[PDB]
Amino acid sequence: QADLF
Amino acid sequence: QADLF
Amino acid sequence: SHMKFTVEREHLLKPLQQVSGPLGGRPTLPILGNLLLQVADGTLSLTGTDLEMEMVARVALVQPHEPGATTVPARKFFDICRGLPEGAEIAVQLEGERMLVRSGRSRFSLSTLPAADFPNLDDWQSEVEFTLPQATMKRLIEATQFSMAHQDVRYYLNGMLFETEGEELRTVATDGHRLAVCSMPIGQSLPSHSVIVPRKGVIELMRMLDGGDNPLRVQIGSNNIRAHVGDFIFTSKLVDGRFPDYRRVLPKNPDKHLEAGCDLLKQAFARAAILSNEKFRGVRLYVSENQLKITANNPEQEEAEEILDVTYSGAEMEIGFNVSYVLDVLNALKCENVRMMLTDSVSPVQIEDAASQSAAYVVMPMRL
Amino acid sequence: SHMKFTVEREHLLKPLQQVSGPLGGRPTLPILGNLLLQVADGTLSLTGTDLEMEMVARVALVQPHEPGATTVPARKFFDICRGLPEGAEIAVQLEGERMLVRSGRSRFSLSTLPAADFPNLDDWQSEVEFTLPQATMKRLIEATQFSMAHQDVRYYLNGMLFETEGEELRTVATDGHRLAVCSMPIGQSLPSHSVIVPRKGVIELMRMLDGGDNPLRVQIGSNNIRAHVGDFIFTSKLVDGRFPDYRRVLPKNPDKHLEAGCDLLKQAFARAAILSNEKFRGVRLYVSENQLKITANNPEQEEAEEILDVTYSGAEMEIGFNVSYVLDVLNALKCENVRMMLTDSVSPVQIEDAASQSAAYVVMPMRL
Ligand SMILES: [Ca+2]
């Protein structure tokens, strides 16, 4: 999972 | 609570 | 395996739901999380088990098929079939150790376990057999199942007695504190016999019955019971234990008879319960000439009082009950008036529909 | 206290259920498991609180009454009212530290705690105010609540941003991986303002609203929010934290637009999900001219593949997603067609109703 912020 | 048997 | 079949989605859903019934969460053995699929003749058979009981469903195959057998993860296979569009054609075949499921533009590869590893609970001989409407069997179960013990160490109470005598079928359930018995004539001369069906099997049998015009065929062996209804066959091991004799428990000489409206009585007990002890749920009943008073008190010194007009013959008396036991009985009875037969504050009471003797409930009091 | 009132059962039931909302069943203090009752003028007010939020209900009193106040166990008092028969008149008065409830032939004595001991969360000043149909506020919350964080250490994400701009009210929710934003015009010029409502307050506000058009008056203070609809007033403390600058996480120029039927897309993702990794839920999307391919595999090397015709004219591309995040969005959108807007495999996707821009969902991909 990548981060939005 | 009493016992039936 | 050679196994191949193509079946329309809606012919699989209810079979898959029924045979998945015995499956719990987190299998002890991995294969118990799988369903056995078997193609033979023009029939697909689906089987699920937990080693104590098994459910089989038969599905006719009108499209091309090839015989064989395998086992497939139940939840995954059910969820795939359920998730496909209405009217989907579900084509199934084996490719090595993988099941391939294809429908429309959807494709799935599932892991299998060999059918030879699946448990079998069918190798036994029936010793008592009879046929009855599903509604009659459902009523027998529903009238008594709430009185089974749920997880008692007395394992023989974690179930329901099924007893045949003459032409009656009888169910009995008890937890040592309260008892339920229901009898139904079934129009067949039967040998005298009784067996204990485990609680989980009782519930599962109940859930397989719809009250349709289909008859239910019951076969009872030395260690198993089997029920055939429609294209479903349920089998359960019996509990190897000795059940108490309900005949000994039923009050013989009750000198006090009370009759009351079931709805008014149930509602009064349900309100009184609110201020009973949260753990032991004790309420007091005071009966006198044509009047019943129900009181409840809790550790906070809170108090409920209910007064009801009833029909009552006998001396004044006070008796204590677990109000949940009383409410369970009144909820099971679907009649306008209920009869309570009593003797004193230390003896069991019998509760029945005032207009029917087919079911009887015996509840033991609590010390006041 | 002097408090006395007689009210019909059905005028109390929904008030009691609403004001009991904030109560969690295991209060830390006994008074927090109680409801505050107050009679003043011809009104009964009922209040329940958990110290972070409070729900108030007002009930007009048309029968004789006397002013006063007390606090009473919520569950017990609700259960008593609900257990009385339809149309029952419920008479309430105080006798020392006990509250006497009488109706028909039923009598109850409940233990009280003084009204002067009940917490108060109403002493604050409104700085932004507006009115909107309750259905509109319910939609705003339902469209976004599923994207709120749960117990994140970034406590300001465990809640919902309410933001006013122009004549629009907007809700925003994010857990740092996906975001939801929904905007509705309300026809009143508003200052630019935003506050964070805690998740429990959001959920409880949603549950106080139905799908009617009845006006909801909202007041936002420096540290609280209040919502009035009908005879109910909800108040919650605001979260004292800074919400992320969500406008800066929205994709700026998505050069790839995909449109598909919401039901077909949802059903395809739901089937693929079955064979995804149970913990990480990753699925692969392959897009090419008017086609989407979804694949999933899990540690057992089981595999699902779905192919759907869509409208897509961008470049070919593969991108990975947590399928639960995608299904949450498609379940929240209640529309016929969906638009997915993409840029590359390391950038978020934005998902909208194909016919409306009132709600937007931003999901960050997975390395996969
Ligand atoms: Ca078929």
Keywords:
heterotetramer; A: 5 residues; C: 368 residues; alpha+beta; eight-stranded antiparallel sheet; seven-stranded antiparallel sheet; 7 helices; elongated; binds calcium ion; Beta sliding clamp (chains C, D); nucleotidyltransferase (chains C, D)
Your description of this structure?
The complex is a heterotetramer, with 2 copies of chain A (5 residues) and 2 copies of chain C (368 residues). With 5 residues, chain A is largely without helices or strands. In chain A, 0% of the residues lie in helices and 0% in strands. Chain A contains no helices and no strands. Chain A is rod-shaped, with a radius of gyration of 4 Å. The N and C termini of chain A lie far apart (12 Å). Chain C has a domain at 4-117: Roll (DNA Polymerase III, Chain A, domain 2), CATH 3.10.150.10. Chain C has helices at 9-20, 74-83, 134-142, 199-207, 246-249, 262-274, 323-332; strands at residues 4-8, 34-40, 43-49, 53-60, 68-73, 89-95, 98-103, 106-111, 126-133, 159-174, 178-198, 215-221, 224-229, 232-237, 256-261, 282-288, 291-297, 303-309, 311-313, 317-322, 337-342, 349-353, 359-363. In chain C, the strands form 4 sheets. Chain C has an 8-stranded antiparallel sheet. Chain C has a 7-stranded antiparallel sheet with strand order 10-11-23-22-21-15-19. Chain C has a 4-stranded antiparallel sheet with strand order 1-6-7-8. In chain C, helix 3 (134-142) crosses helix 4 and helix 6 packs antiparallel against helix 7 (323-332). The chains are: A little secondary structure (5), C alpha+beta (368). The interface between C and D is medium-sized, with 29 and 28 residues. Strand 18 (303-309) of chain C pairs antiparallel with strand 8 (106-111) of chain D, so a sheet runs across the interface.
Short overview:
Chains C, D: InterPro entries: DNA_clamp_sf (IPR046938), DNA_polIII_beta (IPR001001), DNA_polIII_beta_C (IPR022635), DNA_polIII_beta_cen (IPR022637), DNA_polIII_beta_N (IPR022634). The complex is a heterotetramer, with two copies of chain A (5 residues) and two copies of chain C (368 residues). Chain A is low in regular secondary structure and 5 residues long.
